[PDB]
Amino acid sequence: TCPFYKKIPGTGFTVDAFQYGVVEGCTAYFLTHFHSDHYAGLSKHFTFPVYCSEITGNLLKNKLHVQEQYIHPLPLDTECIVNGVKVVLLDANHCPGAVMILFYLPNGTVILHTGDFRADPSMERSLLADQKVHMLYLDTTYCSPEYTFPSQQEVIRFAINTAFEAVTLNPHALVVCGTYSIGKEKVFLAIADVLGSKVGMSQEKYKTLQCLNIPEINSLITTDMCSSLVHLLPMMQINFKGLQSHLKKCGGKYNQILAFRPTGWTHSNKFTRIADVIPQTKGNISIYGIPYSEHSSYLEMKRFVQWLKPQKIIPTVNVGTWKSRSTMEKYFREWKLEAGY
Ligand code: NI
Numbered sequence: 001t002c003p004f005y006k007k008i009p010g011t012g013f014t015v016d017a018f019q020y021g022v023v024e025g026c027t028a029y030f031l032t033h034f035h036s037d038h039y040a041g042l043s044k045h046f047t048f049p050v051y052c053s054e055i056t057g058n059l060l061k062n063k064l065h066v067q068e069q070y071i072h073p074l075p076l077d078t079e080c081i082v083n084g085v086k087v088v089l090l091d092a093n094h095c096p097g098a099v100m101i102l103f104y105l106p107n108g109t110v111i112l113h114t115g116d117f118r119a120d121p122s123m124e125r126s127l128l129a130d131q132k133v134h135m136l137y138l139d140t141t142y143c144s145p146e147y148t149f150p151s152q153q154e155v156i157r158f159a160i161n162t163a164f165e166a167v168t169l170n171p172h173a174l175v176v177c178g179t180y181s182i183g184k185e186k187v188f189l190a191i192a193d194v195l196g197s198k199v200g201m202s203q204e205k206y207k208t209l210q211c212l213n214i215p216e217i218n219s220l221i222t223t224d225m226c227s228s229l230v231h232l233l234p235m236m237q238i239n240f241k242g243l244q245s246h247l248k249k250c251g252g253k254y255n256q257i258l259a260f261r262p263t264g265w266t267h268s269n270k271f272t273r274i275a276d277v278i279p280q281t282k283g284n285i286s287i288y289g290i291p292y293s294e295h296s297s298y299l300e301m302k303r304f305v306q307w308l309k310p311q312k313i314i315p316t317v318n319v320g321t322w323k324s325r326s327t328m329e330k331y332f333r334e335w336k337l338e339a340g341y
Pocket of ligand 1 (some may be wrong): 033035094116
């Protein structure tokens with residue numbers, strides 16, 4: 001049964017609610033982005049209207065085979081009427097095709113659902129500037145002050161410089177990058193660009209990347225592993241065993257692996273600067289864990305919410321424990337008292 005924080009009152013709408021069968025009263029199912037916790041339940045057998053971005057639509061059609069007749073893509077930054085209700089989709093600064101949704105309810109209330117997002121000051125100059133929001137359904141993944149991490153630009157800077165240095169010292173080194181979902185594509189694209197290489201990958205990951213509307217993509221990626229000195233592998237293989245096994249397959253072309261594991265936040269953030277990060281090393285294999293986040297830091301979240309000044313907040317992450325829900329409510333009340341709304 002569909003939980004309350006996935007229902008939009010005063011409408012026939014749900015958000016990211018595909019794992020509960022037919023939801024009573026739902027005339028339109030919104031999908032914020034193509035991550036499995038959110039799409040859980042869709043397939044070629046689905047027969048209700050799905051509303052989403054163009055990119056998310058490409059992935060539904062090609063990767064899950066949803067029929068064309070049930071896919072409704074909407075452009076961003078554009079006022080659209082759906083089942084007689086005005087909606088707008090906004091870029092969420094999460095993974096490719098991810099959106100936030102603004103709903104303009106027939107009674108006058110305005111609701112923002114963030115989906116998954118990484119708050120940014122540029123959002124303060126979207127169509128959000130122009131009117132008041134009564135309810136915010138908020139991505140609270142990192143809603144606690146311990147959750148600190150650097151900008152995406154600093155993380156990419158560290159990775160480019162690390163890879164370029166290593167391969168210039170040893171032209172026979174291979175770079176490997178872990179992946180398990182869409183998002184974070186800048187990590188492997190930036191490293192391959194500086195090395196003058198295409199990125200090599202499986203047929204299945206190549207198919208996924210072809211759905212993303214990335215400019216000039218055919219110039220950037222390939223299924224021919226032999227021509228490439230940046231390879232992608234499933235995240236589960238990014239360990240000493242998996243990487244040894246991969247180096248064997250390359251036919252004595254390479255004699256060293258340097259690998260990157262993009263994670264979310266980890267506790268080594270509480271002591272160490274991005275500059276000071278060191279790898280795990282066994283022999284000719286080194287593994288770097290780098291904190292490339294596609295969710296708001298606590299400081300970014302707080303800045304956005306204090307700017308938006310919503311009348312009510314409904315968290316969508318960490319909602320399963322009393323302690324979690326209580327903690328998040330305390331922070332919302334500080335932020336409100338500090339800013340005066
Ligand atoms: Ni996500």
